[PDB]
Amino acid sequence: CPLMVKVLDAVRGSPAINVAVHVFRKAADDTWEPFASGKTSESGELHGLTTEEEFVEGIYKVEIDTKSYWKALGISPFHEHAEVVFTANDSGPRRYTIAALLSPYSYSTTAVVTN
Amino acid sequence: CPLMVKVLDAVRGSPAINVAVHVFRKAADDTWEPFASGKTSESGELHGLTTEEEFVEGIYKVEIDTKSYWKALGISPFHEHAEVVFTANDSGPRRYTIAALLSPYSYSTTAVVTN
Amino acid sequence: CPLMVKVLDAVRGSPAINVAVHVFRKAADDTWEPFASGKTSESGELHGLTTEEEFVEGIYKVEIDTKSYWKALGISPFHEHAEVVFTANDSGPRRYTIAALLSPYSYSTTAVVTN
Amino acid sequence: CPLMVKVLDAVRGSPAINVAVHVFRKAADDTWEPFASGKTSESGELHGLTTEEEFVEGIYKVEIDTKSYWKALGISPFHEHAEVVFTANDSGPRRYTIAALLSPYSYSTTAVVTN
Ligand SMILES: O=Cc1ccc(Oc2ccc(Cl)cc2Cl)c(O)c1
Ligand SMILES: O=Cc1ccc(Oc2ccc(Cl)cc2Cl)c(O)c1
Structure with a gap:
């Protein structure tokens, strides 16, 4: 597992369960091509x-589909989604965890790069 | 105005109005003594x-009284309050803005320090 | 001024000055077309x-060009940029402030929406 | 384990290792009495x-001893520590994870209350 996503809900103080997550990779023509996707588990994680x-x-x-979540x-959101765009590069052995904390009108995302 | 406090609501995407804020200063005897207090305005700011x-x-x-807010x-939040502790003016007088962003189970705080 | 962008630096505790910001608007053909752009001022704000x-x-x-910043x-950050996607003015004209707080491996963004 | 603490570093995009954490409980005379303490592991967790x-x-x-961290x-911090104050109450079976994301001049903390 070199790439993991973990999402928390700041209103309910809980993992964000069943959030759809789509990952794209940039192609040579500068379009985004589907790469991987899934929905966060009961732990708010997607492995x-x-x-x-x-x-x-x-x-x-x-892309984390926050609006649907x-x-x-029943809670009115501001963003269409939360987007995290980054260059993945090999400097050594490396796991990437993209973490996100969601509020209706705000989110934070952090990268935890380990090993 | 060497110390200003600004509070925003991450659920509503609005300034957090009428938030009580108490400032204390650590005394000679190692005790937290009352320094100043007030309530945020309609802009979410306390001047x-x-x-x-x-x-x-x-x-x-x-101390930002988030639970009362x-x-x-009608929301039952996790935290009693947000507390922000720091040494001030140790390299001469500066201007400090203490910002807080509030959700029911979460908050962030950042300090913007000028001159 | 229906749209304003404010960027702060979480490492230095200061406004994030000279940050490039590009705004796009989704077209009829489902494409991201250029809408407006600029650079933050010494207050970290783009008016x-x-x-x-x-x-x-x-x-x-x-799109906030955090990597260039x-x-x-001299810091090699994780993200290419911060992207903030939202529907605007769908319930009539509003004033939108998009705020971002930046660290090398992390950012948060919140929207303050008035009238 | 009903109470866990997890700390991330937003500058280094990594767990915050070896951060001292002191927990207090409020006594009847309204003083804080030491309750529990430790230092975060290589995962940035304290169990x-x-x-x-x-x-x-x-x-x-x-209290998370951010300044020492x-x-x-070699990085100049603003806060003395990060403080998270809350009422623990039994509404059912309940684990509390206090999460924190640190920058030199900013931090966020969230409560993840599960089970
Ligand atoms: O973007 C802000 C953010 C994202 C996630 C957080 O909780 C975690 C995130 C990642 C990991 Cl590995 C562990 C934890 Cl507890 C958090 O406290 C802040
Ligand atoms: O995530 C975005 C964000 C934006 C602002 C914040 O507090 C402030 C910090 C500096 C200034 Cl000038 C104004 C404010 Cl409201 C903050 O904590 C987070």
Whole structure:
């Protein structure tokens, strides 16, 4: 697991469960191509997006479908989604955890790069 | 205006109006003594807490009464309050803005320090 | 001034000065077209991006060029940029402030929306 | 483990390792009494602070010694510490994770209350 996503809900003080997550990789023509996707588990985590073999250096976009998440709780959101865009590069052995904390009108995202 | 406090609501995407804020200063005897207090305005800002004469070097604690804010809005939040503790004016007089962003189970705080 | 952008530096506790910001608007053909751009001032704020006449209903993306900011400061950050995507003016014209707080491996963004 | 603390570093994009954490419980005379303490592990987590038997309802303060953490990395911090004050109450089975994301001049803390 070189790439993991973890989402928390700042209103309910809980993991954000069942949030759809789509990952894209930037192609040579500068369009985003689908790479990996899933929905966060009961722990608010999404594992198994990719493998070391398929997660080569390049530019990736992780889109967290926050608007749908809030609407399924009856709560009015501001953003369409939360987007995390970064260059993945091999400087050594490396796991990337993209973390996100959601409020209806605010979010934070952090990268935890380990090993 | 060497010390200003600004509070925003991450649920509503609005300034957090009428938030009580108490500032304390650590005394000679290691005790937290009352320094200044007030309530945020409609802009979510609290001005005029102190003057450059009375805001001497020291360790200060800005307590933002987040629980009272949320309960006045029918939300039962996690935290009693947000506390922000820092040494001030240790390299001469500066201007300090203490910002806080509030959600029911979460907050962030940042300090913007100028001159 | 229906759209304003404010950026702060969480490492230095200061406004994030000279940050490039590009705003796009989703077109009829589902494409991101250029809407407006600018650079933050010494207060970390970007004013005059648009006018109430030209800021119509639509889906907007505010891209904050965080990587360029950090690299100009000798820091090699994680993110390419901060992207903030939202529907605007769907319930009539409002005033939008998009705030961002930046660290090398992290950012938060909140929207304050008035009238 | 009813009470866990997890700390991340937003500058280094990594867990915050070896951060001292002191927990207090409010006594009847309104003073804070030491309750539990430790230092975050290589994962930035601190487990085993307490037990279900000893973590009764009451008001607790979790102080994260952020200033020492930053100084041991050569980086100038603003806060003395990060403080999280909350009422622990039994509404059902409940684990509390106090999470914190640190920057030199900013921090966020969230409560994740599960089970
Ligand atoms: O973006 C801000 C942010 C994102 C996530 C957070 O909680 C975690 C995030 C990642 C990991 Cl590995 C562990 C924890 Cl507890 C957090 O406190 C702040
Ligand atoms: O995530 C975005 C964000 C934006 C602002 C914040 O507090 C402030 C910090 C500096 C200034 Cl000038 C104004 C404010 Cl409201 C903050 O804590 C987070």
